[PDB]
Design a protein around this ligand. Sequence first.
Ligand SMILES: [Cl-]
Ligand SMILES: [Cl-]
Ligand SMILES: [Cl-]
Ligand SMILES: [Mn+2]
Ligand SMILES: [Mn+2]
Ligand SMILES: [Mn+2]
Lengths: 468, 468, 469
Amino acid sequence: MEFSTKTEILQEQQAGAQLFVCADKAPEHNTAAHALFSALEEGQNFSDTKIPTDNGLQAVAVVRLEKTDRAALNKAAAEAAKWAQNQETVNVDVHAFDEAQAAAVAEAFAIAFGNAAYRFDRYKKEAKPAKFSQAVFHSAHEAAVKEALRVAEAQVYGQSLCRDLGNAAPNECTPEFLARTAKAEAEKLGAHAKIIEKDYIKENMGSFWSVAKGSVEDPYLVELSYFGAADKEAAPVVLVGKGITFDTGGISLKPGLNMDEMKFDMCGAATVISTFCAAVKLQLPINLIAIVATCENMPSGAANKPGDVVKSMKGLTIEVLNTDAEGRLILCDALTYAEQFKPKAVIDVATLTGACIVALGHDVSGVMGNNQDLIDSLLAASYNVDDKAWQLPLFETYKDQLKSNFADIPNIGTPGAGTITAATFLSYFTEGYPWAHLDIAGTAWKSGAEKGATGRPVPLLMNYLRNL
Amino acid sequence: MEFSTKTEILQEQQAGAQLFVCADKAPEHNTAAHALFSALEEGQNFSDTKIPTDNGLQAVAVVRLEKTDRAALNKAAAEAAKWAQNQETVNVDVHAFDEAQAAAVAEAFAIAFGNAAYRFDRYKKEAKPAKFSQAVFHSAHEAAVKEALRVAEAQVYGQSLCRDLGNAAPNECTPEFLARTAKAEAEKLGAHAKIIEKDYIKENMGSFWSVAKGSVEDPYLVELSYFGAADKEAAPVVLVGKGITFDTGGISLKPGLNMDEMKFDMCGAATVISTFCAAVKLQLPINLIAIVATCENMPSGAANKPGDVVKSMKGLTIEVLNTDAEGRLILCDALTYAEQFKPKAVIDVATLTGACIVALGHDVSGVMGNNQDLIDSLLAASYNVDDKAWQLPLFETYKDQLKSNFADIPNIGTPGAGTITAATFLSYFTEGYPWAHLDIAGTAWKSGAEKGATGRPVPLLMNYLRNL
Amino acid sequence: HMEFSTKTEILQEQQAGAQLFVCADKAPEHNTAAHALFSALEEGQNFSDTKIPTDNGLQAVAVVRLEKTDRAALNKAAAEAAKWAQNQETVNVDVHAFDEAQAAAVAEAFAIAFGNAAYRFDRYKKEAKPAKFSQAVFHSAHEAAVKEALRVAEAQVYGQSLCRDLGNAAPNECTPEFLARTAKAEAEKLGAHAKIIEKDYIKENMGSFWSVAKGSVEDPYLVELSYFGAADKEAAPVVLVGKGITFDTGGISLKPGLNMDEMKFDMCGAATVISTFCAAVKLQLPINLIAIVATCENMPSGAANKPGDVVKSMKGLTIEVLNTDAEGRLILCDALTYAEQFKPKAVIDVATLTGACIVALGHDVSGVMGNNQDLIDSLLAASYNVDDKAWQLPLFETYKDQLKSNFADIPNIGTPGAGTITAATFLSYFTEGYPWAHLDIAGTAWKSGAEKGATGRPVPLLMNYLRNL
Ligand SMILES: [Cl-]
Ligand SMILES: [Cl-]
Ligand SMILES: [Cl-]
Ligand SMILES: [Mn+2]
Ligand SMILES: [Mn+2]
Ligand SMILES: [Mn+2]
């Protein structure tokens, strides 16, 4: 999908589909678009028609934006995008807005257009791609809109990579596949990447290793590096991603129902890799490190056993009471790995707990951390793009739920506050830098007829980076 | 348990048990208390001994307060209180602190002392009461300590009544028992009370009525009134409490395991009734209304059936998809009943959802509402007394989980965010006043060897009232 | 609430209102917008619509491409067109591209789809949101055949809407009394006759029926609807028997709480029988028809049926109630015994009987079982005529071996396996005296999820069976 700009008014004789983003006034010099706007009902904000011409049927649609908030903007853009994905060329008129609103409308509509045109036909006999190829935004504020489309192209690029990695089948998207894809994507954009292999992991990352030993797939730790700040030695932001490419639960085996959706248990890793690549594509003036720990959690004659005590990279011993709580066990070592970079901030992203869905649902990500300024930054970005998030507290009393008579800490706590307890476990490894944790177990994918990866929270994370 | 004050230093020759609350310096004029303080280990903050005297064995104890926060203070006071309940007379020395600190230390220790002396021997053959009867606080700041003990006596008064109502067996604490008890306690303190009966409820509170019809116990709505403001016509604060005196689930029946603890499903009512009485006992200069809807949720040939559509007091029709989500159904009518008082603020307290324990645990109450100033006020009181609470969001997108093809709203939503969804249902009935909701399903009681009501969040609510 | 009419001329482009052209392989000739839509249809696309700006507002124009001629393909195209038609106040349908027989078939299927699409159940809602659709006009050179097709369509839509109204209603409104009195009024509004048997006769003579009802505060009822439209008003009637459990909790054998609201659809068998009866009377079919509905509530109480109880059915067999959630059998068997006093030509009972039928055949195919293969073949034929799918399951004698009791003549449930067939086998002990078939509609009577509601099936199947008598 390609986005361009024009300064002229969208002419009625222009070829292709015509979309008029209106506020309260109907479009003046388009007969069909005027009739559409005049006929809008009480709650209707989108309407379309197909006009017979000498060059075929021409698609004309209008959008009514009464409110100005980003949430209402995203909602209008999504409804129009389901129509735009079937139009090869869409000319969008946003002349009814000042410079600031026109750029915002262009960003949201371009994002909605690109994301709706996404298809994952990789394994299908016949590909059924969308017809949408080009969108042209008509505005008198060319400079602001061009920059808006640049952000939109970067976010859609990131969300698409994230969705491709989450949607892939676990027998294709193995840990090696994930590591090899992250290295190639970063290097295609001019960033740097190194792949740490199993020898180092078994020797220095014992918690990480104990989860991976039970599968025939080798583990990998991926390090993506980008130094785009003026001071190339300034303290970097580090993104840490959970890459369990499939989670059966191990010996603590999961029920068989809906277990296919555990292929999304690397969406945290995908989020981190995609946001990193999106940042490099934007040429953001930041120093950024992406760390991904990836492996498979399988049952076998050599897998982690409940009650096993393993030595983390940091040195704390962890009693693995439940082998299905294994993302904690690869994250804590990756987070210990992160502190060698002396980071300005560490954000980890993980489909960590099903309890987060019980707490906050499928549309709001969970945020926890030890640095309130960092948490407020992430919530600020959440509000900027309407990629919703909410903070859960890391009170010290939750550490009371994590006691073991055998190891330094257990990998699960006493019942209650499941999302916070897992964050508390991780906090024992993040005391040395400002840290926040994004629990995306509910927002990283959807189910039912539209089952697939969502690409969230790439919008939040990328907006956070742009505002550093 | 009576608390008094003296101005003199605690002399070593005083009869009874001797407790020295110290900061960093050992007590000077007590040999035994000096030895205890000097021998305190790294994490030790309490130490006690029994000194042989001519009048028997004398109990001597010390407390070390390194930190000044209320959480650290409450924690030391609780440790000292387990020792104080076995001493008929405890002389507390708090001379090591200035006026502000001495009042805080006396308040927390008197609260800890009184709560530890609480017993529920009502149904037992022989009562085994605590030996604790009197505590005397030695300080040169008699005025501040006298006021602190006045606050402490009110909070212990409220928490004990709250625990007495929550601990009572459901066959004693019937809805009538709860209503008549609230009426008697309010009137004993000079407040007012009227009991609305089943005829009015069946006619005007159809949602409330549909929950109660399935039991042989009549429902009641209790209205407690206190006008302590200078202007007796100024807008009151209204407290609304869920008084399901026992919850079986109805036709949507609950599992048999641990169902006895469903006798605590009226702790919201107990919290409201007790906090109301405590405020009157404090003679707070506020206008306060307490509303309690109480009934039983039983299965019968006349019970609520899943799929029933009932007309609330507000007028909205509710589809009862699950008859175990019935606390919502008495609260919404009680919240509608509240708006005739043109309230300044409405706070409802309920053991509403088991999801809140998944979200926040057993030690943190959930707060949701439509008015951020009211929520911030409650969070402020939460911090003042270390009765922990945390806000969960009422985004408009949670209303998307509450759709029904048959009624205006369903009583449960699509899976996820169970606690927020229940508040969202409730939010449809509170749009006319500043409103907040306390989900105390995790904090109102504990299990195991110490199974019983906790009396929370009476400390939070009472502090909110003192700071009005 | 919807009206269907006919015109003989072609639908002219200047006609006011929405315009729908049901085409075969050729584009519509004298409509520019309709020609453009048809020309742009893609490989699998069979419906397309647009809004043309005119001086009197936006005009809705749509086309349908019917390549195949079978009723299944026809219903599918009509349903897709109906989602568009419900937002059009007036729809003029041109069906000139078809001969007499196909034109009648197209009109019947499209009128049925239109009426069903316009259905709403806003009874309990603050603001009613009805559909704009009111009238459809079918333009054809085959007036007699199209007129008769619309007459059948009006009867089927009338029945399904009544059936859906009864199924969608909340259990605290659609009580057994509500169902019984509603059935009486509908039959009498059409000139048929109705009698309501009350709890005295049921407790005395229908002990199996009564044991299910005693556990609720709602009284039971048995409704008898009578219509004698045959030349000989004393000729042997067709009897429709319907299970009317207005809500089923399971009783002492209590159901899980998840999705139990959908147990308000456990009277859809009764709703099918009541609606099919009324549709037949509305059509003035030349038949003698009896509708029997037994209705009550299955609730848990201190007086409810207990597992292990042995009750004496109306026939006289003793039944061991091993599981109180298998209670629909227990009201049906007494209704079936009641039916044999009419010396029927055929008895068809309709019930949402077993969840096992959904396991066997799914949510889109009803199960058929019976003791008379000609009666079963007739119901399957009607099933195929209207594409209301059904399939036969066998009533082999070896299934009776799964129904043994050391205490009563028969237990109400069998050994594990073949749950739907086992239940029909239980019922078969009470229907040996007349040609009998059984429709298990536990999967087809309603939908779930976002579109949760009653479907009105198998009213299309049953009504066609009556028309083909
Ligand atoms: Cl985990
Ligand atoms: Cl509840
Ligand atoms: Cl049954
Ligand atoms: Mn796991
Ligand atoms: Mn409940
Ligand atoms: Mn049943």
